[PDB]
């Protein structure tokens, strides 16, 4: 509906990304979460 899809991209130099939705209207600030990067095999900041 109103929620858009977004990529959360690894802060490690890998390509790795998670995908999710966001209400861009209500929450304009960028989502940052520590998530597991399986390429480096480490929890690291993801962004977007």
């Amino acid at each position: 509906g109103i929620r858009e899809k977004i990529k959360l991209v690894s802060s490690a130099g890998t390509g790795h990304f998670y995908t999710t939705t966001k209400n861009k209207r209500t929450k304009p600030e960028k989502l940052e979460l520590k998530k597991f990067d399986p390429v480096v095999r480490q929890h690291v900041i993801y962004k977007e």
Binding site: K5, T19, T20, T21
Partner: protein, 64 residues
């Protein structure tokens, strides 16, 4: 004349050692964000064609 293979069947099935057929699972092409990782993970490995379907597959692939 020689039976013709259904070429679209040949691109989707491969004959295994005991003469079953492996195929790739449906539902992992797109609309992936909303699907759970567990669901997607279990769709990655190839699966065997079921007994009900073997007749249809064999008919399509006479030279498998």
């Amino acid at each position: 004349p020689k039976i013709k293979t259904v070429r679209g069947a040949a691109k989707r099935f491969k004959k295994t050692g005991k003469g079953g057929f492996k195929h790739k699972h449906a539902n992992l092409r797109h609309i992936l964000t909303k699907k759970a990782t567990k669901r997607k993970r279990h769709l990655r490995p190839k699966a065997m064609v079921s007994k009900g379907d073997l007749g249809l597959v064999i008919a399509c692939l006479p030279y498998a």
